[PDB]
Amino acid sequence: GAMNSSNYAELFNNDIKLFVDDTNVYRVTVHKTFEGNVATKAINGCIFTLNPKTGHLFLKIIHTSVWAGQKRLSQLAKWKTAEEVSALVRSLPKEEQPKQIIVTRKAMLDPLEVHMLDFPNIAIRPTELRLPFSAAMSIDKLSDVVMKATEPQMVLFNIYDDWLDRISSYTAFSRLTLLLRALKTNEESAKMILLSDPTITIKSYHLWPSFTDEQWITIESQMRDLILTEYGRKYNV
Amino acid sequence: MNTVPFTSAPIEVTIGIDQYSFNVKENQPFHGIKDIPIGHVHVIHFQHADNSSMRYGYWFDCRMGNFYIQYDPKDGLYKMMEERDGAKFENIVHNFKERQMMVSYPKIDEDDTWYNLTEFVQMDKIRKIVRKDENQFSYVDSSMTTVQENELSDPAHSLNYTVINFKSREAIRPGHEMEDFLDKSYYLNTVMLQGIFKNSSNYFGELQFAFLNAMFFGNYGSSLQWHAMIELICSSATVPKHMLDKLDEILYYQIKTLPEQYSDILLNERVWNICLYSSFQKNSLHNTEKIMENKYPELL
Ligand SMILES: Cn1cnn(Cc2ccc(F)c(Cl)c2)c1=O
């Protein structure tokens, strides 16, 4: 059934699973035409497919060429997402295929179910959680590879850097969600915090700064304040 | 005109014959039903006074044999049987008819309701859905489950309707996932029509038979089959014009006949609103939409 507050720890057991987020697959800019009408221009997007136990991120770049000549693009985007996820599963050896795929939006359920009819043993699940994966394009290196792509491409990341060397997957997932919740609520502040230290470095092979344990506490604390804060500035509390 | 004589009526029962019905009191002098129109299937059904639970009945065609009803006090129901001795049947029937102990199938001569509800229903096909090949008539009741329901327990007592499943490999061609799910024409026209049913008449016949088992017996599994076969057509962008026109007539008379106070349970909101207002065929069911909107506008 649905993934929610009450079965949260299942993500970190030893059953392979993936989250699929489709919020950044079909991205547009809205602009005015010479005649004073409105039109859209597509820009490159990505599918965010994440193993929450390992932090492996299969970032499928959706190049704007895939929309050429197509109608009903918001609907196609969900099927295109489902098609790329089921291609990914088919490319993996059986023992690496997920036992569950959890979609962050319910509108992906039918598209993925249909593309996965060949895999009746993979449970396709929604969730009641308001996960902040849409903010993945606020991570500079992710945003950069998506915008630079000139063709369809799959890029692999570990969204946890080397954190699992020191913390558990439960705690790494929780840091990830805080960072992204922060980025979603106030990207400028969020980034000011992370890059607040002129002496700190993000490794070439990483997405986030190389914080010490103690520095992560400070950072995580500052990201909590931000999320509470913007909650005031937005609600006047 | 044919006759379904009754040996007697030992328990109080409500008897249904096609869309008609009447009450018989315990040990009332009653020896069955006469003047039944030849050329159509018929259904004679039962609801005991003491247990409105379980409505059961028999689908039959009088052209296929001489049939009668006798209550069985061991199994506790009115059972259909075949009299193979034709002369004896005639002597027995003629005797009940002269003593005026039979009710008359009460067909108004303007009325084509029963024809319209059974136009494509054929006893040979019913007997493939209801497997019991040693009888020429077919028993159905409220509790019988469908082959698809058993996939989701006694196979011999099941309703072997054609399995429709919109999220199945049968329904979905590899590489046409989105196409085949949003426009089921391939599944309707090639898989089901050309492949399984062979023609639209057999399709409509199963559809009409499912509805009638729903209406007369509250056989949930039939209700599900009926809606599924409607929805498969409505969700197909490409349907022969003749099938659409015939479908409109078929459903019009089903909705016209449905007991008003059963529409809440039977009629599936999602399927009808989709079929009438969102689907490819939203503009092709004028008669059905007009009767639905004037009779059950709550549901929409
Ligand atoms: C009179 N008696 C009583 N039972 N049997 C068989 C039977 C009975 C009633 C009928 F309506 C028919 Cl068709 C046949 C019989 O010979």
* CATH at B155: 1.25.40.550
Residues A102, A10, A96, CA angle at the centre, nearest 5°? 65
Give the chain B residue whose CA is nearest to the CA of A112.
B177
The DSSP secondary-structure symbol of A117 reads: T
Choose the CATH number for A9-163 among 3.30.420.230, 3.30.420.240, 3.30.310.40, 3.20.20.450: 3.30.420.230
Element (H, E) at A45: strand A45-50
Tell me how far apart the alpha carbons of residues B133 and A154 are, in angstroms, rounded to a whole number: 60
Tell me how far apart the alpha carbons of residues B18 and B44 are, in angstroms, rounded to a whole number: 6
Query: B8: closest CA among B27, B22, B24, B33?
Result: B27
Query: A83: closest CA among A41, A123, A114?
Result: A114
Whether chain B has a CB inside 8 Å of the CB on A52: the answer is: no
Most ligand 1 atoms within 8 A of CB, residue of B30, B34, B68, B84 to mutate: B68
CB A182 within 8 A of CB A227: yes
Element (H, E) at A102: strand A100-103
Whether chain B has a CB inside 8 Å of the CB on A220: the answer is: no
Listed in sequence order, the residues at least 6 apart from B62 whose beta carbon sits closer than 8 Å to its beta carbon are B2, B3, B4, B36, B38, B42
Q: Residue A107 Cα, ligand 1 centroid: separation in angstroms?
A: 63
CB B213 within 8 A of CB B205: no
Whether chain A has a CB inside 8 Å of the CB on B269: the answer is: no
Method for structure elucidation: X-ray
- What is the residue extent of each domain of chain A? 9-163, 164-237
Listed in sequence order, the residues at least 6 apart from A37 whose beta carbon sits closer than 8 Å to its beta carbon are none
Strand B56-60 to strand A17-21: parallel, antiparallel, or no bridges (unpaired)?
A: unpaired
Interface test with A, best of B166, B170, B176, B178 (most A CBs within 10 A): B178
What secondary structure does DSSP assign to B78-145, as a single string? EEEEE---HHHHHHHHHHHHHTT-SEE----TT--HHHHHHTT--HHHHHHHS--TTSSSEEEETTPP
Q: Which residue has the tokens 């009115």?
A: B78
A136 Cα to chain B: minimum distance (Å): 27
CB B42 within 8 A of CB B35: no
* CATH code for the domain defined by A164-237: 1.20.80.40
Element (H, E) at A54: none
Whether chain B has a CB inside 8 Å of the CB on A162: the answer is: no
Query: B115: closest CA among B233, B198, B201, B208?
Result: B208
Query: B181: closest CA among A123, A115, A88, A120?
Result: A115
CB B204 within 8 A of CB B120: yes
What secondary structure does DSSP assign to B158-216, as a single string? SB-PPP--TTSTTT--TT-HHHHHH-THIIIIIIIIIIIISSHHHHHHHHHHHHHHHHH
Phi, psi angle pair for A33, to nearest 5° = -90, 160
Q: With an 8 Å Cβ cutoff, are B172 and A76 in contact? A: no
- Mapped onto helix, strand or coil, the DSSP state of residue A83 is helix
Whether chain A has a CB inside 8 Å of the CB on B177: the answer is: yes
Describe the strand order of the beta sheet including B13-17 as a list of residue ranges: B20-24, B13-17, B42-48, B56-60, B138-141
Declared resolution, Å: 1.7
Phi, psi angle pair for A225, to nearest 5° = -55, -50
Domain that holds residue B277: 116-299
Q: With an 8 Å Cβ cutoff, are B169 and A113 in contact? A: no
Give the chain A residue whose CA is nearest to the CA of B181.
A114
CB A45 within 8 A of CB A81: no
